[PDB]
Amino acid sequence: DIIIATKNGKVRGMQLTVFGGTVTAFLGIPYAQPPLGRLRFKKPQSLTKWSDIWNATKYANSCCQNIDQSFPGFHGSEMWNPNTDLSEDCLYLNVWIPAPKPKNATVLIWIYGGGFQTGTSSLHVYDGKFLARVERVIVVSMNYRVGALGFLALPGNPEAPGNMGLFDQQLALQWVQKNIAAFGGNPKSVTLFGESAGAASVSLHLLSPGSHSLFTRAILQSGSFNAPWAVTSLYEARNRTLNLAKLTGCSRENETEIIKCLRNKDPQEILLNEAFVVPYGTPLSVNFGPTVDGDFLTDMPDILLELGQFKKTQILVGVNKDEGTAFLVYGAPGFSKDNNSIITRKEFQEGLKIFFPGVSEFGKESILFHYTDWVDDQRPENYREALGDVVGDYNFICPALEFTKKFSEWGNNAFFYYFEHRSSKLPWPEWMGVMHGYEIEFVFGLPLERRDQYTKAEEILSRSIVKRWANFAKYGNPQETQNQSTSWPVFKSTEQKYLTLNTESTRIMTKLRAQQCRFWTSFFPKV
Numbered sequence: 001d002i003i004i005a006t007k008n009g010k011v012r013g014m015q016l017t018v019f020g021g022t023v024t025a026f027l028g029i030p031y032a033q034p035p036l037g038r039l040r041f042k043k044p045q046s047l048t049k050w051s052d053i054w055n056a057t058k059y060a061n062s063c064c065q066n067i068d069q070s071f072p073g074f075h076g077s078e079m080w081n082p083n084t085d086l087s088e089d090c091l092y093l094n095v096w097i098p099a100p101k102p103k104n105a106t107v108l109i110w111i112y113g114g115g116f117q118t119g120t121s122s123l124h125v126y127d128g129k130f131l132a133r134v135e136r137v138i139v140v141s142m143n144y145r146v147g148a149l150g151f152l153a154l155p156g157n158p159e160a161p162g163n164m165g166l167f168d169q170q171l172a173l174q175w176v177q178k179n180i181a182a183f184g185g186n187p188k189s190v191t192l193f194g195e196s197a198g199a200a201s202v203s204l205h206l207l208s209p210g211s212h213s214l215f216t217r218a219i220l221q222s223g224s225f226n227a228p229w230a231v232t233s234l235y236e237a238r239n240r241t242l243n244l245a246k247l248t249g250c251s252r253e254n255e256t257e258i259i260k261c262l263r264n265k266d267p268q269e270i271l272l273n274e275a276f277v278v279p280y281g282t283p284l285s286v287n288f289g290p291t292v293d294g295d296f297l298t299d300m301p302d303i304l305l306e307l308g309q310f311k312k313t314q315i316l317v318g319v320n321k322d323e324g325t326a327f328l329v330y331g332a333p334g335f336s337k338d339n340n341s342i343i344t345r346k347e348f349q350e351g352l353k354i355f356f357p358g359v360s361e362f363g364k365e366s367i368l369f370h371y372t373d374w375v376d377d378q379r380p381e382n383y384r385e386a387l388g389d390v391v392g393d394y395n396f397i398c399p400a401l402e403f404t405k406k407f408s409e410w411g412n413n414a415f416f417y418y419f420e421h422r423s424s425k426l427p428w429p430e431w432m433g434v435m436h437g438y439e440i441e442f443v444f445g446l447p448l449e450r451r452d453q454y455t456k457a458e459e460i461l462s463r464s465i466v467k468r469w470a471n472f473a474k475y476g477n478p479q480e481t482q483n484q485s486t487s488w489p490v491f492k493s494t495e496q497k498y499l500t501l502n503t504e505s506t507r508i509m510t511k512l513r514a515q516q517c518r519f520w521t522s523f524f525p526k527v
């Protein structure tokens, strides 16, 4: 029986058998006052002490969120839906520690994604026990508020200041600083890692002065704050808050009185109205996301990045070969997960209008022109593949490359990866390729479990990636030094080398998507 005295009271964990060894798990430790009643829409409050023993023996509630039912019964989408009760009382975190208790272990803190509208730390592909077992690091993950409940912004109004979910994440980092030593962890060796909106959160913690001293290094998988979906302007943030107020019958002339009215609404009334706060949307719509609040974010983050105003440390950044394709089956005409989605030129043009609704006709013609220079113009997958690359390059790859270039210009080691292995267990069809989200299981080491029917080559690849991530967190350098691997070189603004990750041949290349990213980063903003 293992029990740990934290600064707020004793917690009891559970022992787990992983790979013929033991990992101790503390699931569902509270780290803030439940943000209920008058605390809804406020920054999270400090946790009042307790004198009993908290049984941290099961995952806690997930934060309120809509659950999309686009593919009912399909494991490809339902593996992402919350697997605990939805409650506003969701500010809990989880801790995996190796057995026996380590002496001074490096800590990896996961921040899940989900477009800032969904997500929970209890997903099976976020299970930190494999990493604890195999690399003897400590894994932490927290639940943070999402959607309106996490990001509604009446900016300057402390009743709804914005960025509440980001402050949830920060309060959890603060908990690790105060308490992880009691679990055998090293508060001075803390690496944040997250994917998608979680990766954008990680990059915002690099900009936030309150987070500076709460972590050492950062890993950004398929996301960064300069991605077009990742920050909502103050103009949209106020239009969306007032639209949500109109939809719930909460329009009041006193801005503080709107929030009082929204605080008496059921979570479901708020959730069912989150969709319609914008008149036009896309599959990458983020209706309630990070804002420049003057607190977590002191200025527009593109300015902070461009002028070197961020934590100076190492970063690991990367993207997957087919970031875009998942978004095509959530709205592009002619696309299906149940057929090969061969689309015509005309369907490609309608696809562009879906993803770029307020872009001029000339702007959409420029995208078409850049992306239809066929190698083989007889190839019938041509338009299907170009629309995927349009959405992936614009929304993830080019922003991540630009983040890494600007960050490394201020003298820090950066490492960039290109993940191009399609999981053999991937439930989505083959035309969707190496999808958004499907490197996570490799990072968390699920293919290390031989029972799970991943291939042998996939076990090798996961084993290698797990070591690289752990070596980055421990030593700031993501090498696999023992198995004659390819050496991962630093990403420099001039050569811009990156590592490809795959089963067959991990190799070094330069200037990923160079021509595409010139179009998106330099030309497309002008249209």
Ligand SMILES: *[C@@H]1O[C@H](CO[C@@H]2O[C@@H](C)[C@@H](O)[C@@H](O)[C@@H]2O)[C@@H](O[C@@H]2O[C@H](CO)[C@@H](O)[C@H](O)[C@H]2NC(C)=O)[C@H](O)[C@H]1NC(C)=O
Residues within 6 Å of the ligand: 239, 242, 243, 244, 246, 247, 276, 277, 278, 279
């Ligand atoms: C800012 O919001 C207004 C209002 O949005 C409408 O009302 C909300 C309560 C919600 O139901 C939304 O879906 C509505 O669109 C936007 O004004 C609307 O714009 C559309 C398209 O331009 C137009 O067809 C509607 O008639 C407008 N309705 C009203 C009441 O003005 C406005 O576009 C938003 N500003 C943005 C998005 O920049």
Ligand SMILES: *[C@@H]1O[C@H](CO[C@@H]2O[C@@H](C)[C@@H](O)[C@@H](O)[C@@H]2O)[C@@H](O[C@@H]2O[C@H](CO)[C@@H](O)[C@H](O)[C@H]2NC(C)=O)[C@H](O)[C@H]1NC(C)=O
Residues within 6 Å of the ligand: 332, 333, 334, 335, 336, 338, 339, 340, 341, 342, 343
């Ligand atoms: C691929 O499928 C899409 C979606 O159609 C649905 O799924 C299919 C597997 C099949 O079971 C269809 O009967 C389903 O309706 C096809 O696009 C649809 O085409 C119909 C035909 O007129 C149209 O009414 C719908 O609006 C279309 N929906 C979308 C989202 O485009 C598409 O034609 C199929 N492509 C190929 C190459 O077979």
Ligand SMILES: O=C(CC(c1ccccc1)c1ccccc1)NC[C@H](O)CNCC1CCCCC1
Residues within 6 Å of the ligand: 067, 068, 076, 077, 080, 114, 115, 116, 117, 118, 196, 197, 229, 283, 284, 285, 286, 326, 327, 330, 435, 436, 437
């Ligand atoms: O997950 C989200 C987030 C959202 C998003 C928006 C902007 C940036 C990044 C992500 C998204 C992601 C993928 C498709 C559509 C939307 N929203 C809930 C929807 O159920 C999407 N299902 C989640 C998974 C679908 C298949 C593979 C990817 C994950």
Ligand SMILES: *[C@@H]1O[C@H](CO[C@@H]2O[C@@H](C)[C@@H](O)[C@@H](O)[C@@H]2O)[C@@H](O)[C@H](O)[C@H]1NC(C)=O
Residues within 6 Å of the ligand: 103, 104, 186, 188, 189, 216, 473, 474, 475
């Ligand atoms: C635990 O280790 C501490 C040193 O941590 C190391 O230095 C910092 C700057 C980071 O770069 C981190 O990655 C390193 O692991 C010691 O200061 C501390 O006294 C140690 N405490 C115990 C109990 O062992």
Ligand SMILES: *[C@@H]1O[C@H](CO)[C@@H](O)[C@H](O)[C@H]1NC(C)=O
Residues within 6 Å of the ligand: 012, 053, 055
């Ligand atoms: C916590 O778990 C132990 C052992 O399973 C049990 O004896 C104890 O009563 C539990 N405490 C609470 C508050 O449920």
Ligand SMILES: *[C@@H]1O[C@H](CO)[C@@H](O)[C@H](O)[C@H]1NC(C)=O
Residues within 6 Å of the ligand: 254, 255, 256, 257
């Ligand atoms: C609005 O509500 C707040 C909260 O009680 C109050 O302080 C303020 O005086 C009210 N009136 C105006 C005009 O802000």
Ligand SMILES: *[C@@H]1O[C@H](CO)[C@@H](O)[C@H](O)[C@H]1NC(C)=O
Residues within 6 Å of the ligand: 460, 463, 464, 467, 480, 482, 483
């Ligand atoms: C290196 O190779 C051995 C077998 O030769 C394997 O057991 C080990 O897990 C590998 N390590 C990494 C980090 O890939």
Ligand SMILES: [Cl-]
Residues within 6 Å of the ligand: 233, 234, 235, 292, 300
């Ligand atoms: Cl702004």
Ligand SMILES: [Cl-]
Residues within 6 Å of the ligand: 321
């Ligand atoms: Cl490619």
Ligand SMILES: [Cl-]
Residues within 6 Å of the ligand: 366, 369, 370, 519
């Ligand atoms: Cl061009």
Ligand SMILES: [Cl-]
Residues within 6 Å of the ligand: 345, 377
């Ligand atoms: Cl053609």
Ligand SMILES: [Cl-]
Residues within 6 Å of the ligand: 428, 429, 430, 431
């Ligand atoms: Cl297939």
Ligand SMILES: [Cl-]
Residues within 6 Å of the ligand: 340, 381, 431
């Ligand atoms: Cl095909």
Ligand SMILES: [Cl-]
Residues within 6 Å of the ligand: 484, 485, 486, 505, 506
């Ligand atoms: Cl190799």
Ligand SMILES: [Cl-]
Residues within 6 Å of the ligand: 512, 513, 514
């Ligand atoms: Cl390329």
Ligand code: NA
Residues within 6 Å of the ligand: 512, 513
């Ligand atoms: Na390429």
